[PDB]
What we know:
The chain is an alpha+beta fold. The protein folds into 2 domains: 80 residues, Pdz3 Domain (Roll), CATH 2.30.42; 94 residues, Pdz3 Domain (Roll), CATH 2.30.42. Strands 7, 8, 9, 10, 11 and 12 form a 6-stranded antiparallel β-sheet that branches. A 4-stranded antiparallel β-sheet has the order 1-6-4-5, with no helix packed on it. Strands 2-3 form a two-stranded antiparallel ribbon. It is elongated. N-[2-(4-hydroxyphenyl)ethyl]pyridine-2-carboxamide binds next to helix 2.
Amino acid sequence: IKQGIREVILCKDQDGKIGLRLKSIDNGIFVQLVQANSPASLVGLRFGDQVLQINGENCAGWSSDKAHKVLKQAFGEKITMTIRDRPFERTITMHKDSTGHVGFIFKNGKITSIVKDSSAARNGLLTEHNICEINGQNVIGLKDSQIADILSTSGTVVTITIMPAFIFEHIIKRMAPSIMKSLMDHTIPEV
Length: 191
Ligand SMILES: O=C(NCCc1ccc(O)cc1)c1ccccn1
């Protein structure tokens, strides 16, 4: 989680899509969904990201509807966007024990308890926080099943990106859980 406002430059794909849903939160606009193999993935937009400007205009106070209408009306040879990096999230690094554990339980992405004498415990991992990424890989929508499988195959240093549940539940409302599952970019980044 950088302390960074950065500029990204986008390009509507062949069908006029950039692959992005936006959500009004606290008079800001946030990334609710980055679609896999989209403009928005290639430039490296991330769930939770904040969109400060779109073509040099401020997003402050915009409805979701307007953000989306703004995107459609734009001449997608070049869309500029000014981004604040995942501002509602934090990253925690942890090391697995010899039993491979980091030392928590989660349910529906959400960390529900912490296990005494663990790295989870040593590192002040918190409950009531949804899991957003792991070692930099979006994991929103996947079954708990599949998130366990990522954790097991991670190596010792595991890196988790969390978000307060209340904020998380506020971001994803009005998005059908299957769209999340199939269409949210769960892929490692291209170079
Ligand atoms: O993209 C537009 N609106 C955002 C999508 C939408 C949301 C709600 C609604 O009721 C209808 C459309 C648009 C495009 C041309 C003229 C006006 N609006």
